[model samples]
Target: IPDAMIVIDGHGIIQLFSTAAERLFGWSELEAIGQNVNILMPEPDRSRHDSYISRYRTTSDPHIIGIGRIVTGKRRDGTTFPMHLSIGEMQSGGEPYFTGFVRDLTEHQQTQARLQELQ
Candidate 1:
């Protein structure tokens, strides 16, 4: 509500990008939609999203469908920040709406990077 909300289907296609999410991730709704949801993450997390989202959709892995998870977020500015991430389902056959609040760690700063890979 106050922080950010993102919605994506089981295949990880981003559908909804809230205004709060735009501010939080530094990605405008127009820029972010029709994209894979992993662009917000760094390195390993970015690479792992396929397996993560896939397994979750297939077998419902861990609490990816639940709350209070902490992860690093790569802002469009390229700086990574701590996010209190949560997830829930939608009726669009397994689309998940994501909820995220900011900051658990507090030090590093980086750039407003547009993604390199667009798939």
Candidate 2:
């Protein structure tokens, strides 16, 4: 369990992860398992993800699917932050999987908040 690690499936279903993910999403691995990746994201981005995956699965044009991309993750309080997500391909017993490493922009968020407070 690293300070910042999240592993989800190719289908965008969160399968396993670390305690850092818990801090980021306010949900433990046990609680997050079997849940959709959108659960940790906000509306618009959250809703957009499923279609993105579905499109790639059908078209195979090689878009953001399984590729390292930057996105936003929404917290339980509706506060969203920038995140970098990197995916690694994997397989177990012929079952496909994806490992996503997440990096949250807490410093960026704090900087914005501080600037706003000065106003």
Candidate 3:
């Protein structure tokens, strides 16, 4: 598995979970799978996630796909942090899937702040 991997179905339901993802998001594979991936997101993103997926499926227009960006993620403990995310579209057994690669940036952001203070 990659650093943090998550596979969701066309309906945005979590189908696959990785160890790194559990460590990053504090959701175990057992709890995460069979749930909506939006549970990991915070605020507006969580509310609009399904719409974004639907829009992409119908228009095939790229938004977050192929573009890695820093996004906010919520952990099980109700803490929100920055995370880098890149999504990809895939098909398996005639089913559509979205795979996301995530990298936690909380520590990275903290380190950058510390360096800036020293400079």
Instruction: Give candidate 3 misplaced runs (Cα > 4 Å).
Output: none
| Model 1, residue 83: C-alpha shift (Å) | 0.9
Residue pairs in clash, model 1: 76-112, 76-113, 77-111, 77-112, 78-111
**Residue range 1-119, candidate 2, lDDT tens digits:** 36567676667888786888888878878888889888888878788888877776678676554567777888767788888877666787676676778888778878999999999
Q: Pick the candidate with the highest lDDT.
A: 3
Pairs in clash, predicted candidate 2: none
Which RMSD does model 3 reach against the true structure?
1.3
Model 2: C-alpha RMSD to truth? 2.9
Q: Per-residue lDDT tens digits of candidate 3, residues 37-117?
A: 989988889999999999998998888898778989999999999989999889999989989999889999999999999
Residue 29 in candidate 2, Cα distance off native in Å: 1.4
Cα TM-score of candidate 1: 0.75
Cα lDDT of model 1 by residue, 1-119, tens digit: 36587777766778888887887788899999999988989998898897887686678666645555767789998988876776766574443554334443433322223232332
The deviation in Å at residue 116 for candidate 1 is 37
What is candidate 3's CA lDDT for residue 22?
A: 94
Error of 3 at 59 (Å): 0.8
